[PDB]
Amino acid sequence: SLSTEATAKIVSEFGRDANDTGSTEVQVALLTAQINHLQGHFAEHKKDHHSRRGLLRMVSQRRKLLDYLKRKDVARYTQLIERLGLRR
């Protein structure tokens, strides 16, 4: 996905400590920065339909993880949607 400095910092941004890495809100941010990383790639590489499968995997993976926090605790849901720029 990214390097070590980009991965470990965002875990420290949204996690309570360095060990808070398996939570769902971190997993949204790992996919949010990755899709934002691949914005300029697929614009130049529209004939790369095989890497688009990896892109559509992560869009579908982020949608399923947003559905878990929304159905359980909407207070943490309303924080992260505007903090990363979701809901369009």
Partner RNA sequence: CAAGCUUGAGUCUCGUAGAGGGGGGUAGAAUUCCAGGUGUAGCGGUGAAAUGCGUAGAGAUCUGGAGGAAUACCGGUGGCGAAGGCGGCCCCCUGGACGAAGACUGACGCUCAGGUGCGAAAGCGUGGGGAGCAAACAGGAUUAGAUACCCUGGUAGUCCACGCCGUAAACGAUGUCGACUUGGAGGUUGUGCCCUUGAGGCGUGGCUUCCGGAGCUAACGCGUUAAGUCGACCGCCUGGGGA
- Sequence-separated (6 or more) residues with CB below 8 Å from residue 27: 65
Residue 78 tokens read as 């309303």
CB atoms within 10 A of CB 61: 14
The contact pattern for RNA, residues 2-41, with x = CB under 7 A and - = no contact, is: x-x--xx--x-------xxxxxx-xx--x---x--xx--x
Q: Which is nearer to RNA, 13 or 20 (CB)?
A: 20
> Alpha helix locations (H) across 1-88?
4-14, 24-37, 39-44, 49-72, 74-83
Closer to RNA by Cβ: residue 10 or 83: 10
Smallest separation (angstroms) from RNA to the CB of 83: 18
Q: Which of 39, 43, 47, 87 touches RNA by CB under 7 A?
A: 47
Four-point Cα dihedral 66, 7, 45, 53, nearest 10: -50
The binding site for RNA (CB under 7 A) comprises: 1-2, 4, 7-8, 11, 19-24, 26-27, 30, 34, 37-38, 41, 45-55, 57-58, 61, 64-65, 68, 72
